[PDB]
């Protein structure tokens, strides 16, 4: 079930973890083998999976057009890299000792659980207001002055690569 979950958190839904187009990832119903109290923490854990799926679906779709949208998604995968890498690790720890429960797996995500939520509305403002052109370099900047240290250190990376486009065009013109 562990390796079953670590795929559900990767973007592959199955029988245990059904997928709904509106709500998001969620557990189907009660399971006899597992306890009836875990049916909650998983639902708390899926609130993270829904973010990665809705992320990568948008990343692939590229949707609106413009280089500054292409580069934003190009950078959006970079901040999302430590999420994947930290997920590959969970399997290694479970491969060693077979006494680790979902509690430890839920504990390992820790930082990703408090980061995705704040970096979810930044995407929603784009797809809901048709933010076309260089105006992205402000809509992302107005959210770069956030208090959360992890976020203040995430969006700054995206702004650091999104400026690479302007810096490309600006030098090409001047």
């Amino acid at each position: 079930m562990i390796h079953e979950l670590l795929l559900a958190l990767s973007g592959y839904p199955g029988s245990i973890f059904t997928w709904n187009k509106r709500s998001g990832l969620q557990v189907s119903q009660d399971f006899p083998f597992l306890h009836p109290s875990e049916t909650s923490v998983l639902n708390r854990l899926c609130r993270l999976g829904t973010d990665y799926i809705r992320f990568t679906e948008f990343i692939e779709q590229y949707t609106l057009h413009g280089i500054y949208l292409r580069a934003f998604c190009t950078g959006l995968d970079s901040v999302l890299q430590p999420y994947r890498q930290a997920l590959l690790d969970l399997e290694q720890e479970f491969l060693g000792d077979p006494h680790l429960s979902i509690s430890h797996v839920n504990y390992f995500l820790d930082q990703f659980q408090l980061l995705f939520p704040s970096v979810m509305v930044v995407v929603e403002q784009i797809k809901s207001q048709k933010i076309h052109g260089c105006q992205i370099l402000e809509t992302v900047y107005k959210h770069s002055c956030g208090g959360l240290p992890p976020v203040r250190s995430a969006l700054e990376k995206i702004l650091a690569v999104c400026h690479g486009v302007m810096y490309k065009q600006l030098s090409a013109w001047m």
Partner: protein, 205 residues
């Protein structure tokens, strides 16, 4: 309902063969030029459905590499442009094949599972998706001068869209496809005559 209950490592080896472009595989049995996962495959874990999910994605990549292999086949078994275009495509496959072949070495001789070989192949499954869109405009089309002009012009347009590793691919794919024209153009200049075949050049004299 019965199922075959394949082991785990056997899947990765099969996935590598799909990446290689080989056909007639116990998994991913194509029917009409469209690779498709079987229905009785199951592992001890992954509840028989996630496996149908994860394989379904890799299958989508097999289509990109199976169709290209069908294209290269229909050139081997004097256009001077398609034949010069596949040699660029063919050259890319050999190097790509070496990375996949190398991985197979570390399987027979360290633990290796599904979620590791995929993430190890990220900078390849990215470069491959581009070709599914670049080649899609080189296959959707009758005269020999419009099939070669519209192809060669699609690259120079698709590169300006991408202006780093993806640009190095398209550029290295460009030069080996404009080599015919640059030859006849020079040959027309210094040797004073236009030596074309099948009226490939745009100047149909």
């Amino acid at each position: 309902d019965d199922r075959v209950l394949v082991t785990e490592t056997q899947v990765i080896r099969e996935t590598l063969w799909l990446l290689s472009g080989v056909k007639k595989l116990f998994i991913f049995q194509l029917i009409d030029g469209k690779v498709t996962v079987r229905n009785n495959i199951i592992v001890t874990h992954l509840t028989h459905s996630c496996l149908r999910s994860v394989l379904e994605q890799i299958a989508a990549y097999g289509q990109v590499v199976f169709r290209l292999q069908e294209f290269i086949d229909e050139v081997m078994g004097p256009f001077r442009t398609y034949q010069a275009f596949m040699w660029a495509l063919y050259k890319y496959f050999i190097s790509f094949k070496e990375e996949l072949a190398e991985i197979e070495k570390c399987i027979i001789n360290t633990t290796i599972t599904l979620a590791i070989v995929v993430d190890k192949l990220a900078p390849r499954l990215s470069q491959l998706k581009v070709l599914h869109k670049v080649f899609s405009t080189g296959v959707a089309e009758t005269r020999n001068v419009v099939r070669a002009s519209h192809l060669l012009n699609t690259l120079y347009k698709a590169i300006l869209e991408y202006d780093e590793q993806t640009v190095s691919l398209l550029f290295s794919l460009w030069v080996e496809t404009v080599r015919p024209y640059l030859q006849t153009v020079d040959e027309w200049i210094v040797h004073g005559h236009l030596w074309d075949g099948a009226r490939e050049f745009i100047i149909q004299r």
